[PDB]
């Protein structure tokens, strides 16, 4: 993993999973796996610090980029098979307050929870105050509108 954070093997590519109770290590580098970016947390706290943010503000006149952000190793790519074995905090807030609230073994954190939505579902505002199939009819109709 340390090598992956350092990019001696391609992030977006290699998936690497250990199934402890079976003593197996599966690694995947085939095309076609669905994966998403997540923040790394370490020693019960987030590894990304606000100084990385100040470089991102700096991008308005600097070469610093999302790829540099991946090069800090503060974010990782996680496919669905690997996502099964991570302990994933919902939001920096929850990972912070924690003491005896739930657990302290987290390994990743969500860059923002509303990202679980697909393209058309994001147009619809307060989607969580709606009854769930109501959101599905809007995703069809929004795609149906003109402009």
């Amino acid at each position: 993993r340390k090598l992956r954070r350092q990019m001696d093997i391609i992030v977006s590519e290699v998936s690497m999973i250990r199934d402890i109770r079976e003593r197996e290590i599966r690694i995947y580098t085939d095309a076609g796996r669905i994966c998403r970016p997540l923040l790394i947390v370490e020693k019960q706290k987030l590894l990304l610090k606000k100084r990385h943010i100040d470089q991102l503000k700096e991008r308005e006149y600097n070469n610093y980029s999302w790829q540099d952000l991946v090069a800090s190793g503060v974010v990782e790519y996680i496919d669905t098979l690997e996502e099964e074995t991570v302990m994933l905090a919902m939001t920096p807030d929850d990972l912070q307050e924690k003491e005896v609230a739930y657990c302290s073994t987290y390994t990743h954190c969500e860059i923002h929870p509303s990202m679980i939505l697909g393209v058309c579902a994001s147009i619809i505002p307060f989607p969580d105050h709606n009854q769930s199939p109501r959101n599905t009819y809007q995703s069809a109709m929004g795609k149906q509108a003109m402009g």
Binding site: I20, R21, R23, T85, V86, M87, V100, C103, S104, T105, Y106, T107
Partner: protein, 125 residues
């Protein structure tokens, strides 16, 4: 000679043929009235060690004693309980989980694996 107790004689399959390296089957000596084990594909024969040749079911070897390797303690998605004292090591922070598997023993009984050294000890409560 009592109703209470246990019986784990340690079943035996392999002690395969030494001459051709194949599986042994029980067989009779009607002349000595003694069990023998013979390879079917050769003349090799050898005396048995136990009078048992086969067993089936056990109503519950609950089989908590094995399978679950101590390494399971490393998994971050498994809960750390503050419930203390690995009965062996003077340290808390047991990892626990229920049962797993499909014969999951309808049991809901927690299985505890200490994660500290000075043991690697498994126990149930």
């Amino acid at each position: 000679m009592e109703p209470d107790g246990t019986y784990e004689p340690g079943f035996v399959g392999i002690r395969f043929c030494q001459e051709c390296n194949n599986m042994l089957y029980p067989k009779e000596d009607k002349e000595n009235r003694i069990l023998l084990y013979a390879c079917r594909n050769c003349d090799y024969q050898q005396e048995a060690d136990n009078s048992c040749i086969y067993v089936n079911k056990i109503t519950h070897e609950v089989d908590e004693l094995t399978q679950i390797i101590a390494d399971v303690s490393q998994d971050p998605t498994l809960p750390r309980t503050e419930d203390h004292p690995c009965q062996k090591c003077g340290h808390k922070e047991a990892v626990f989980f229920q049962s797993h598997s499909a014969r999951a023993e309808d049991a809901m009984r927690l299985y505890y694996v200490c994660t500290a050294p000075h043991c690697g000890h498994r126990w149930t409560e």
